[PDB]
């Protein structure tokens, strides 16, 4: 009936707009990527910096933290995904591996394990790699527009992505062949995320609507909309239990829609520019966000 | 309470050190200015950037980052060539650059409408209304030759040129033909109409004439950056 939160904490030190953000499996630490080129690892529980990686290329659009909590992947408009060490015995963060082969700007990346990774790019394809040798093993194709999101399902065997054409497509990693496609939206996707049970998955759009789909479904479940809002959506998220949903908006604001309530509730306001990313801890003790105003305001 | 001792030691050793380093690096970060470059395939943008770099790249097979310096103020310029033709998404990564360099092929009248549409889209884009754009027109000498030969006359793509008249603002160059100036400033006004009709004070477009061989473009970009920052300062220091 009503939802509200305050800016519990704030992270300061980034010198430009934050484009990406990701935690680690250990919820106390989180990665952050900014156009300034710094992949700062912050100690969340004490709002402290623990590392400062100088990225090779300033134009970063992605950032990922390995499930083991050691390796961190970074990349963006340079068409390359780079890996670094954090828990190495040398005591200094250093490059471990670099992945190359895409023909478009890197859009998302996600670790599968300590020795594997999956990624999506703006060349209308997704790829799977081996960390040990840095070689491809399966490439995914079938979209028409740029791909701009990923959501590795908890059953990592399957994953889904959204594109700039009116379609979102599913791929099974070991088989490398598309097996479903939905097309309801009119102005197409910018983000996607999965449900803990894995059957349903959310999605953002350029038109002022959020929509839902499910694996068992061959139909667009629904679409949320508000009459007075024109701008688009920029990201999504889920709850620890998963029932409740959320998203980020273009007009310097968030807007919390819920599927179970099926209607919106409140807003997280306080940024003075676009919100470009979101995220929650693996344990759900805290929630974070990023913005083009360079503050990862962490909310109560 | 050895846990508290370890926490204090880790905090003191790590955060102080790396935050001192971070301030040191921020000092460098502010002093450096970053600019985006745009242009058509047949435009001279690659040649322009190469000339500036020679006047004094950080990547290949992707972003063609470049460095240059003027008046001991360090600059960065970025050319995104490692992407397919669709622009509407990756373009907004540059919403915070000081300015956007926009190059057009004025001799290629076929693309003049395409470049006009692209410039319209850039000018009215939600995330670029606050970012000044620098306009560059090239292959100007070919315009007179095209008028003489008329393989694809100006009127074929813009009949407004026939009814058009040279403006009082016109400043024909010393060794330049007048009617060629008429047509050249005519296309300039074609773009400036888009610039001004729906523009606002929070935006500006600076036209300039040049061929790729000209080295002054770095200083022009520098001076227009000065102008942009000066207006942002007027707004910031409460003079407006």
């Amino acid at each position, epitope marked *: 009936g009503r939802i509200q939160m305050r800016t519990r904490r704030t992270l300061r030190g980034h010198l430009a707009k934050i484009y990406a953000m990701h935690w680690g499996t250990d919820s106390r630490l989180l990665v952050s990527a900014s156009q300034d080129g710094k992949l700062i690892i912050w100690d969340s529980y004490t709002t402290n910096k623990v590392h400062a990686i100088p990225l090779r290329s300033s134009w970063v659009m992605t950032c990922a933290y390995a499930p083991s909590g050691n390796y961190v992947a970074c990349g963006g408009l340079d068409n390359i995904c780079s890996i670094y060490n954090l828990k190495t015995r040398e005591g200094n963060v250093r490059v471990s591996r670099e992945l190359a082969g895409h023909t478009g700007y890197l859009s998302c990346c996600r670790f599968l394990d300590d020795n594997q990774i999956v990624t999506s790019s703006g060349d209308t394809t997704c790829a799977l790699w081996d960390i040990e040798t840095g070689q491809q093993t399966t490439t995914f194709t079938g979209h028409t527009g740029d791909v701009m999101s990923l959501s590795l399902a908890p059953d990592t065997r399957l994953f889904v992505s959204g594109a*700039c054409d009116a379609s979102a497509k599913l791929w099974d990693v070991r088989e490398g062949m598309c097996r479903q496609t939905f097309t309801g939206h009119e102005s197409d996707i910018n983000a996607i995320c999965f449900f803990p049970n894995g059957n349903a998955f959310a999605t953002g759009s350029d038109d002022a609507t959020c929509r839902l789909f499910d694996l068992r479904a061959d139909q667009e479940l629904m679409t949320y909309s508000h009459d007075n809002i024109i701008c688009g959506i920029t990201s999504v998220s889920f709850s620890k239990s998963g029932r409740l949903l959320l998203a980020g908006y273009d007009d310097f604001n968030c807007n919390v829609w819920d599927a179970l309530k099926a209607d919106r509730a409140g807003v997280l306001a306080g940024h003075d520019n676009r919100v470009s990313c979101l995220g929650v801890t693996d344990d759900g003790m805290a929630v974070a966000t990023g913005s083009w105003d360079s503050f990862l305001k962490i909310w109560n | 309470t050895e846990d508290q001792r370890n926490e204090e030691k880790a905090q003191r050793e790590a955060n102080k050190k790396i935050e001192k380093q971070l301030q040191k690096d921020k000092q460098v970060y502010r002093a450096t200015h970053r600019l985006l470059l745009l242009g058509a395939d047949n435009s001279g943008k690659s040649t322009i950037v190469k000339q500036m770099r020679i006047l004094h790249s950080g990547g290949t097979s992707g972003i063609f980052e470049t460095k240059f310096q003027v008046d001991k103020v360090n600059f960065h310029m970025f050319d995104v060539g490692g992407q397919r033709d669709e622009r509407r998404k990756w373009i907004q990564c540059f919403n915070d650059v000081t300015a956007i360099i926009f190059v057009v092929d004025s001799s290629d009248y076929n693309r003049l409408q395409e470049a006009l549409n692209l410039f319209k889209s850039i000018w009215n884009n939600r995330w670029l209304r606050t970012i000044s754009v620098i306009l560059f027109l090239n292959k100007q000498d070919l315009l007179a030759e095209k008028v003489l030969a008329g393989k694809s006359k100006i009127e074929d793509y813009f009949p407004e040129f026939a009814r058009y008249t040279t403006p009082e603002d016109a400043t024909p160059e010393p060794g330049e033909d007048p009617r060629v100036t008429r047509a050249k400033y005519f296309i300039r006004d074609e773009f400036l109409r888009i610039s001004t009709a729906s523009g606002d004070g929070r935006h500006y477009c600076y036209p300039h004439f040049t061929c790729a061989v000209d080295t002054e473009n770095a200083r022009r970009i520098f001076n227009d950056c000065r102008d942009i920052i000066q207006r942002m300062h007027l707004r910031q220091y409460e003079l407006l």
Partner: nanobody
Amino acid sequence: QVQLQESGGGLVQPGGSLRLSCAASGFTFSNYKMNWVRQAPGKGLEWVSDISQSGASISYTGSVKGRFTISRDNAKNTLYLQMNSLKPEDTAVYYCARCPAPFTRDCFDVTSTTYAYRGQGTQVTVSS
């Protein structure tokens, strides 16, 4: 599915013009910007006159200026075109197209190859 289907075409000659009718379906018509776009033998894509949202404003380029009749109608979700001063150059696939986002003047990629939001088009046989 988001699609724009065109109808009308065939026999044409100098001094004689057909009527081009477009059928937008499964997509909100008024609030989006509209515009034609053509492709002809031996050349790529070319821009054509537009009509703003709710049919407010119009624009043209030189080759087409003052010789074709652009218009939009909410009663049929259609654009219209009738030709004057017809030439063999009229032969082309008339892709009924629309801009990617609503309530905006941005139409970045309508001319882009493999652009999603455009129709199949129809052809006219200019002959004499």
